[PDB]
């Protein structure tokens, strides 16, 4: 009934004593010699179709009927009747059938695994990755800041930064190609960005050069090439573009108020353009920010849609087959309060006082505030000029974050249901929200004012990291310690429906348990192939 | 599906610490003065950051591993280039192993519940709230009179 | 000539019973023995409270 | 008045294992896997896996 996701998370996890688990996440935890045992008849009773997640539901009226929602990808086949070794071997079939070429090695996957298992990740990296909103010119103004950040994180700790957000990855790949960043540090980002191109090449090679009508068949065979799948974070407007390029019916539920047409764009979206293109309304947007009822703002303050040559696929590949396997799904949605983090900057002494020279370090003359502890726990020495440039991204910065429930139709060969309500698939997209690695208590004690945990996905809803970010779910996984499983963690009902979801528990247990290597990335890409007859045709051909 | 974050070098250097007759007793008096408190550890951060950097750059071994809270605090704090590059990684690996073994024991116990509580206290004897760690600094004693 | 397996899971019908876990009958058989053990230890049987 | 071995959790089999085992990953895994109880539902969770 509202925009604000902090109260959405808080009213679910306040006094949560009953922690019930889904039946698709219950079977997911069994082996195949135990699933077919006659004691688990209450889970074998509704496993009677390889494509459909039949559930009885609840006796709402007098007599309740069963509902069958599609298992879209082959990854949603359960761990009993499709184990992790089977998908890991299908990945090695897929790697030689489509002739995939791994550009990364175990070194790159190791240095990406050592960041999500690092509790010493600087929270200053989250505030620069939050003050940039996937914008290009916001990254141009912070080239010395991030060239200080990645170098100070690579020389000291050996890991590479900003690897949670694809936008920072591609901005580092194109802008930081000089000798600003280090050689091997840039090499790791180059490998990370090249493997998504290679996996998109292999998915295009599996999809083939066959077209249905005028459109290709690649949206009918895989889910990563499907334009009706959205990446979990939408920093710019990929929603109106989804309304344009869809032959099916997207029904974007932006705070209990849907919209299914492009003529209703400014009724539901407000484009945040460039900095010079908003200079005639800086004070208007700030008055809408400071003075405004943001609680019920059914408007998205999104950026403009840039149209990169790869349509939407490298975002989906990075967020679905690279990060949920390199990190073992140890991430959660990091909703940022944006007026509280730019109150932290543009304050505290030298950011407001211009008496200091612009190339002097801030930490020897920073008062005892939340910015000084934000750089004390991280041990980086930025100048005052980069912090002034980073605070300067506040007039065109959006006010809050909010999650939005995109409810697109199923594929045309997956729309055979009797009811029209389970002919659809849902996808919660975190608008202007980050994704986070593991927090410490020293980080949570000083960034409780800035960020808040949003468990909203299967790979981005880990309670091993949300309990380090939200104190009210840490008592949830103290009371019920079985909720620490990524497949069985309770997520908010307004924020994540399991049965109506692209990636269910079956893929959440492959993500959270596989060893991070090349065979796991190829196995996760090869379990994104749909259970559609065009996928059967394009798999029999290879 | 356990994943060891610890290699053989970390175990072979923890065994190097434990078989050291010349282990400094000053690292016992520092842990005695702190005794597992978070407020007392941040007073002595420029003390322990010199301690475990002269023990590392002197002998190759890592200090304070004889007590859990004294390396939990080194996992939280002291990653801000206070310790050396290859010495903080050993404490981080020792702390990450315990989370990996906790996840493995939780996956062993499963996602089934009896009554209203879990079966982690019933399957294993490490997920049992009744068993206490052998070294107490804070109050873990009023707690098991309320939850058990 | 079918190859039926015998898991641990089939033996749970007898390994989960409160007769396999009670010591009452073995102690009833040992306390009623006509010739018990001659070497008694009393080293750490019971805690003494200081 | 400090340690009565019969009324304990970890007994002489545990110390006899830990004093002889070579310190590696298989010993850490064996010590983690010998802390499982002997409940009926400790055998249920070992029959499932």
């Amino acid at each position: 009934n509202h925009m604000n996701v902090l109260v959405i998370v808080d009213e679910f996890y306040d006094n949560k004593y009953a922690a019930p688990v889904t039946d698709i996440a219950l079977k997911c935890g069994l082996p195949t010699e135990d699933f077919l045992h006659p004691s688990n008849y209450d889970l074998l009773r509704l496993e009677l179709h390889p494509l459909y997640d039949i559930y009885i539901g609840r006796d709402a009226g007098e007599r309740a009927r069963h509902r069958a929602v599609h298992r879209l990808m082959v990854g949603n086949l359960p761990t009993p009747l499709a184990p992790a070794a089977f998908q890991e071997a299908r990945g090695q079939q897929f790697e030689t059938a489509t002739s995939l070429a791994h550009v990364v090695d175990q070194a790159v996957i190791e240095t990406v695994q050592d960041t999500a298992y690092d509790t010493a990740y600087p929270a200053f990296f989250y505030v620069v990755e939050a003050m940039i909103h996937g914008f290009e010119e916001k990254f141009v103004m912070n080239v010395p800041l991030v060239s200080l950040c990645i170098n100070t994180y690579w020389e000291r700790s050996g890991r590479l930064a900003f690897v949670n957000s694809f936008s920072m990855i591609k901005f580092i790949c194109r802008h930081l190609g000089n000798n600003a960043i280090s050689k091997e540090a840039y090499s790791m980002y180059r490998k990370i960005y090249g493997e998504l191109i290679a996996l998109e090449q292999a998915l295009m090679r599996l999809a083939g050069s066959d077209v249905v009508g005028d459109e290709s068949v690649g949206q009918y065979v895989c889910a990563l090439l499907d334009p009706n799948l959205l990446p979990p974070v939408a920093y710019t407007d990929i929603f109106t573009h989804l309304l344009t390029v869809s032959d099916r019916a997207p029904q974007i539920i932006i705070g209990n108020e849907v919209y299914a047409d492009t003529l209703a764009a400014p009724q539901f979206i407000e484009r945040v353009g460039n900095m010079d293109e908003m200079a005639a309304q800086f004070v208007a947007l700030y008055g809408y920010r400071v003075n405004g009822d943001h609680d019920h703002d059914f408007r998205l303050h999104l950026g403009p849609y840039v149209d990169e040559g790869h349509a939407d696929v490298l975002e989906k590949i990075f967020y679905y087959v690279f990060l949920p396997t390199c990190t073992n799904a140890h991430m959660c949605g990091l909703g940022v309060d944006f007026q509280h983090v730019a109150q932290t900057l543009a304050y505290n002494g030298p950011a407001f006082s211009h008496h200091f020279t612009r190339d002097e370090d801030i930490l020897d003359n920073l008062e005892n505030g939340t910015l000084r502890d934000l750089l004390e726990i991280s041990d980086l020495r930025p100048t005052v000029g980069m912090i002034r440039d980073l605070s300067a991204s506040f007039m065109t910065c959006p006010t809050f974050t909010r999650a939005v429930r995109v409810s697109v139709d199923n594929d045309v060969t997956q729309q055979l249901a009797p009811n029209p309500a389970d002919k659809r698939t849902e996808q919660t997209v975190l608008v202007n929200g980050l994704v986070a690695f593991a927090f410490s208590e020293r980080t949570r004690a000083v960034t409780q004012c800035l960020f808040h945990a949003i468990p909203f996905h299967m790979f981005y809803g880990d309670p091993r990291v949300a309990a380090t970010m939200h104190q009210d779910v840490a008592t949830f996984v103290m009371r019920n310690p079985q909720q620490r499983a990524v497949e069985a963690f309770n997520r908010p009902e307004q924020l994540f429906a399991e049965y109506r979801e692209w990636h269910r528990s079956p893929m959440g247990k492959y993500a959270a348990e596989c060893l991070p290597s090349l065979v796991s990335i190829s196995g996760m890409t090869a379990m994104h192939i749909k259970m559609s007859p065009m996928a059967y045709i394009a798999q029999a051909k290879l | 599906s356990l994943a060891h974050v610890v290699d053989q070098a970390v175990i072979e250097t923890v065994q190097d610490t434990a078989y050291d007759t010349a282990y400094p007793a000053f690292f016992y008096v520092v842990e005695a003065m702190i005794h597992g408190f978070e407020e007392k550890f941040v007073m002595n951060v420029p003390l322990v950051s010199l301690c475990i950097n002269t023990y590392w750059e002197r002998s190759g071994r890592l200090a304070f591993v004889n007590s859990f809270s004294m390396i939990k605090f080194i996992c939280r704090h002291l990653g801000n280039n206070a310790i050396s590059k290859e010495a903080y990684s050993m404490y981080r690996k020792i702390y990450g192993e315990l989370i990996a073994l906790e996840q493995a024991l939780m996956r062993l116990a499963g996602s089934d519940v009896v009554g209203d509580e879990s079966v982690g206290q019933y399957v294993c004897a490490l997920l049992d709230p009744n068993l206490l760690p052998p070294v107490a600094y804070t109050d873990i004693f009023t707690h098991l009179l309320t939850v058990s | 000539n079918l190859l039926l397996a015998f898991n641990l899971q089939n033996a749970l019908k007898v390994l989960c019973h409160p007769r396999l876990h009670t010591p009452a009958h073995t102690l009833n058989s040992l306390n009623a023995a006509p010739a018990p053990r001659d070497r008694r230890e009393t080293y750490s049987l019971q805690h003494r409270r200081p | 008045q400090l340690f009565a071995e019969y009324r304990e959790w970890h007994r002489s089999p545990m110390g006899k294992y830990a004093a002889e085992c070579l310190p590696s990953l298989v010993s850490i895994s064996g010590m983690t896997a010998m802390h499982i109880k002997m409940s009926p539902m400790a055998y249920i969770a070992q029959a499932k896996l």
Binding site: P38, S39 | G115 | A11, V14, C16 | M41, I44
Partner: peptide, 20 residues
């Protein structure tokens, strides 16, 4: 009783009788 009816349900409660 929860433990008793969990144990009794998770295990089950000419076939040759085959004891252990």
């Amino acid at each position: 009783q929860q433990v008793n009816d969990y144990i009794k349900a998770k295990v089950g409660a000419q076939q040759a009788t085959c004891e252990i």
